[PDB]
Amino acid sequence: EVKLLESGGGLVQPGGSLKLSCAASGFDFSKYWMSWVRQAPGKGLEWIGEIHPDSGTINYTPSLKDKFIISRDNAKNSLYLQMSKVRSEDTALYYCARLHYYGYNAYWGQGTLVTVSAESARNPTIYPLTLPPALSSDPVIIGCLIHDYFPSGTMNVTWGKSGKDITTVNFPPALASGGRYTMSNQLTLPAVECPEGESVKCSVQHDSNPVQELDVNCSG
Amino acid sequence: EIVLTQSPAITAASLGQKVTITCSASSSVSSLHWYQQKSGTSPKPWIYEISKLASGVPARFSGSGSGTSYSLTINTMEAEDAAIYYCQQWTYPLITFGAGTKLELKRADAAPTVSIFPPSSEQLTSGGASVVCFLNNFYPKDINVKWKIDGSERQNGVLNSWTDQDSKDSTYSMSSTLTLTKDEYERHNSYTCEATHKTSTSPIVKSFNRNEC
């Protein structure tokens, strides 16, 4: 099956430059027109441009013609994007897509995040959200505070328990003052499903980093 | 060069009601396509070449139009159809995307459930103290949260995050985090989270008292 995997994203200094890559598999790359699309946090879709299968014709969004260079190998089955004098404004998920006839983006990658900042990377600290016996119950609400991390990236949060009446809410990251993000994850479950003395594990995965696990108590 | 206008920009439909959204172009386009996008996902190919449904699109969806004005229709609005819908034109050598239409599922009014969480002993060790308030399963989306420390309002160090419309419940959730120092936390005793929502005349208050121990 068709696969597109973008890499090369991460933290880049303002005024810097980087090259992104999109690895294609499960189709003969050499026969298809390929494109790049971007999406800034909370904004819509913006086309960057496209490349002809044999590199002869490269089309761009007129405004962006001045800072992006699209290229491809064909041997390596990779598509590239060179970004040259990166502004805070350029912070976005960059998606490569395989074009079909009539300029349709038939298959899309999962995107790679580019964070244009001077602020140093920081791993989250995870804290338990549990309330004392005389503060809540039925249903039980437990959580994991994922605090003070940068850049935002992709956060995978999984809980040790799942069911029909067990609800997970993953709150989108919020940016503080310093320039550090915080998110919270919450689990709601019937009190009968989370008795006192028992715990539920929250599993946090920040980007390609090892999982951070926390045992959260049903009651304080 | 070619401007696309999606209308309405923000819309709502009840379960089982017929919905039509439109995409109009400033000049004749060669082709037009639609994409669906949900919360933390890549855009999904939805309708291509004006009326063809992509691989796993439900039969309730249809695309129409020609020349300059195009439409997307949902015969029976389902809870899972609550998403952003993007139109896209192709006219060689350009591709342009519309600004998107946010489609919300119109549901019954629902008051938020407020829960207040005192700081962790683990965080307190670090010399930090985050007080977290969760506001769950409310409709409509509009809400105002206030924090009070010893009965007086606190504005700074408040982090707010709003959820995505749940598409099983068709509800919204919100988190409000007050971060203080261990010294600042230990100087006060009562912590209160108050929510203002249409479903109540008065504020929905949830508070805790930190004393003695």
Ligand SMILES: *[C@@H]1O[C@H](CO[C@H]2O[C@H](C)[C@@H](O)[C@@H](O)[C@@H]2O)[C@@H](O[C@@H]2O[C@H](CO)[C@@H](O)[C@H](O)[C@H]2NC(C)=O)[C@H](O)[C@H]1NC(C)=O
């Ligand atoms: C990172 O993500 C996966 C989630 O995997 C899938 O399942 C959900 C329902 C679906 O919407 C997609 O997100 C994926 O298809 C984690 O998988 C789960 O985690 C635990 C391990 O801690 C397993 O024991 C569960 O069975 C497993 N899957 C399911 C059924 O949800 C993966 O581990 C996670 N990383 C972490 C540890 O946070």
Ligand SMILES: *[C@@H]1O[C@H](CO)[C@@H](O[C@@H]2O[C@H](CO)[C@@H](O)[C@H](O)[C@H]2NC(C)=O)[C@H](O)[C@H]1NC(C)=O
């Ligand atoms: C993408 O490819 C086409 C090639 O046709 C370019 O179109 C030509 O260039 C200009 C403006 O588009 C026209 O005025 C010419 O008549 C076009 N055609 C010819 C004769 O080939 C288009 O400019 C290319 N580039 C991008 C970056 O938009």
Ligand SMILES: [Zn+2]
């Ligand atoms: Zn073509």
